[PDB]
């Protein structure tokens, strides 16, 4: 998915 | 190419509404988040919001939520920012931006591509021509104080442009009043004519002022 | 929710390596991005995931991290690099339900000193007689030929620090590559008479230049 927002290592949304 | 092209500058009186745009091209508009950032003149970047074009999922800065609304129109690849009721403190430059997904063992995101910025000015100033006052004089400073004009710009030349060196003309002050003033000084080596030509095309004011020293 | 802190200014000589720090509560488990903005222009992405450069960004810029602190390092620093730098990360607070936030730093102004220090010429003008038959009074303090482009202006009634009517422009690069700025003191013809002398005192890099005027 391209709606992916990553804040940090192993911390992701969508 | 691959870009974000924003709509033009805006001057609005308080209480008016407004909708500015952000047209993407060169990539799949639906599949990356669009952000919006504001920057007041001479301050840092301020997050307003992000929105996912594909489905219009949105997240707002608590500083802007409900003050302003994000939206898209997929039919034309456009993002929008909408105010219902403008205020003095909405003045600033607004940028839209695309969040890029950088993939790998480590995936991340960052805002790679930016609009050129939409300027918004909220003012109740009405057009005003400037008054021109002489600033009587090794070197010697003289000049013209160009006073109380709206809006920008004024250009200022000397001796009908005949005199170029020893000419500095200042950035202009947006006085608390909501009108601008500037001055234009010429440092020189008297007895010679010396006239400052002020042009403020927004009001069609042309003023030629003779500068001589204290009698 | 937390805040990113960067120092507001950094100054370096051409060639010196410049360093810009960015601190914040959860920075160590958070990817930091860095942005450049030249005033009047759009931001430019220099760095994502702490340390990775977008295609086109030169190798002399490098990103690093240690504890809650991200750092941007600029080596071979040259004048083109002058401008503002911003870090940014994300925050996800429950507060149930997940609230997303883009966090910016306050920004850091980088100056590169590309010429020797030069004191300003100050010119203080008194209200013209013309301006006086109009029942306004304007003192015009013109500050030129200084380098680097940062000053502070103090105004003064006899020897009293005044702040009413004081408008001052941000310095801007002149023709000859030195800076200019101007300060305005807006008063009434009554206040102009109401005092013996008026003072403009420009401080530049710790040294100050004063011009003074008097009615009439």
Tokens of residue C173, six digits: 């690069």
CATH number at residue C33: 2.60.40.10
Q: Give CA separation, C158 vs C137, C163, C214, in Å.
A: 17, 14, 10
C91 touches A at CB < 8 Å: yes
d(CA C100, CA B187): 56
Tokens of residue C160, six digits: 């009293």
Specify whether the CB–CB gap between B209 and B144 falls below 8 A: yes
End of a domain among B109, B124, B139?
Answer: B124
Secondary element (H or E) of residue C3: none
C50 touches A at CB < 8 Å: no
Specify whether the CB–CB gap between B197 and B156 falls below 8 A: yes
Examine the domain organization and report whether C98 and C131 are in the same domain.
no
Report CB contact under 8 Å: A7, C91: yes
Nearest by CB to C86, from B45, B95, B114: name it.
Answer: B45
- As for how many domains chain B has, the answer is 2
If you measure CA to CA, which chain A residue comes closest to C98?
A: A13
Examine the domain organization and report whether C98 and C127 are in the same domain.
no
Report CB contact under 8 Å: C29, A5: no
A9 touches B at CB < 8 Å: yes
Examine the domain organization and report whether B26 and B109 are in the same domain.
yes
- DSSP type of residue B68: S
d(CA C111, CA B26): 36
End of a domain among C79, C95, C114?
Answer: C114
Examine the domain organization and report whether C90 and C181 are in the same domain.
no
- As for how many domains chain C has, the answer is 2
Examine the domain organization and report whether C110 and C166 are in the same domain.
no
Specify whether the CB–CB gap between B134 and C128 falls below 8 A: yes
CATH number at residue B184: 2.60.40.10
Beta C83-93 vs C99-104: how paired, if at all?
A: antiparallel
Please list every residue in chain A whose beta carbon sits closer than 8 Å to the beta carbon of residue C100.
5, 13
DSSP string, C56-114: TS-TTEEEEEETTEEEEEE-S--GGG-EEEEEEEEEEE-----EEEEEEB--EEEEE--
Report CB contact under 8 Å: A13, C91: no
Q: Could you tell me the residue range of the domain that residue B76 belongs to?
A: 1-124
Report CB contact under 8 Å: C100, A13: yes
Question: What are the residues of chain B with a beta carbon less than 8 Å away from any beta carbon of chain C?
Answer: 35, 37, 42, 44-47, 50, 59, 61, 95, 97, 100, 102, 106, 108-112, 114-117, 131, 133-136, 139, 141, 143, 145, 147, 168, 170-173, 175-176, 181, 183, 185, 187
Examine the domain organization and report whether C57 and C130 are in the same domain.
no
Examine the domain organization and report whether B61 and B95 are in the same domain.
yes
A4 touches B at CB < 8 Å: yes
Report CB contact under 8 Å: A6, B109: yes
Which method, experimentally, gave rise to this model?
X-ray
Tokens of residue C15, six digits: 């060639």
d(CA C161, CA C156): 5
Ramachandran category for residue C177: left, alpha or beta (phi over 0 → left; psi -120 to 50 → alpha): left
Examine the domain organization and report whether B175 and B205 are in the same domain.
yes
d(CA C183, CA C140): 6
DSSP string, B17-53: -EEEEEEEESS-GGGSPEEEEEE-TTS--EEEEEEET
Secondary element (H or E) of residue B84: none
Please list every residue in chain A whose beta carbon sits closer than 8 Å to the beta carbon of residue B27.
none
């Amino acid at each position: 998915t391209r709606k992916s927002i990553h804040l940090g290592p192993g911390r992701a949304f969508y | 190419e691959v870009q974000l092209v924003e709509s033009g500058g805006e001057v609005k009186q308080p209480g008016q509404s407004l909708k500015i745009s952000c047209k993407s091209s060169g990539y799949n508009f639906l599949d990356s988040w669009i952000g919006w950032v504001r920057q007041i003149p001479g301050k840092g970047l301020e997050w307003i919001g992000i929105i996912y074009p594909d489905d219009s999922d949105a997240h707002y800065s608590p500083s802007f939520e409900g003050q302003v609304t994000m939206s898209v129109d997929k039919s034309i690849s456009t993002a929008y920012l909408q105010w219902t009721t403008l205020q003095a403190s909405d003045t600033g430059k607004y940028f839209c931006t695309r969040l890029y997904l950088f993939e790998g063992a480590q995936s991340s995101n960052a805002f790679d591509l930016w609009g050129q910025g939409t300027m918004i000015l909220v003012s109740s100033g009405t057009t005003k021509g400037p008054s021109v006052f002489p600033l009587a004089p090794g070197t010697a400073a003289l000049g013209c104080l160009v006073k109380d004009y709206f809006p920008e710009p004024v250009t200022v030349s000397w001796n009908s442009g005949a005199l170029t060196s020893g000419v500095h003309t200042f950035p202009a002050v947006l006085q608390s009043s909501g009108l601008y003033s500037l001055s234009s000084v010429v440092t020189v080596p008297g007895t010679q004519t010396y006239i400052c030509n002020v042009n403020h095309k927004p009001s069609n004011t042309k003023v030629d002022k003779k500068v001589e020293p204290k009698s | 929710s937390y805040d990113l802190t960067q120092p507001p200014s950094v100054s370096v000589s051409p060639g010196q390596t410049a360093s810009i720090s960015c601190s914040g509560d959860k920075l160590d488990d958070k990817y930091v991005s860095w942005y450049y903005q030249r005033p009047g222009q759009s931001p430019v992405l220099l760095m994502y995931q702490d340390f990775k450069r977008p295609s086109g960004i030169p190798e002399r810029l490098s990103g690093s991290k240690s504890g809650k602190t991200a750092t941007l390092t600029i080596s071979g620093t040259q004048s083109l690099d002058e401008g503002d730098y911003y870090c940014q990360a994300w925050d996800a607070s429950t507060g149930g339900g997940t609230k997303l936030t883009v966090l910016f730093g306050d920004g850091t102004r980088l100056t590169v000193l590309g010429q020797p220090k030069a004191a300003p010429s100050v010119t203080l003008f008194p209200p013209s007689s013309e301006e006086l038959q109009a029942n306004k009074a304007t003192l015009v303090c013109l500050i030129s030929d200084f380098y680097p482009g940062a000053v502070t202006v103090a105004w003064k009634a006899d020897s009293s620090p005044v702040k009413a009517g004081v408008e001052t422009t941000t310095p801007s690069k002149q023709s000859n590559n030195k800076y200019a700025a101007s300060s305005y003191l807006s008063l009434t013809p009554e206040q102009w008479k109401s005092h013996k002398s008026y003072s403009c005192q420009v401080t530049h890099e710790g040294s100050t230049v004063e011009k003074t005027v008097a009615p009439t």
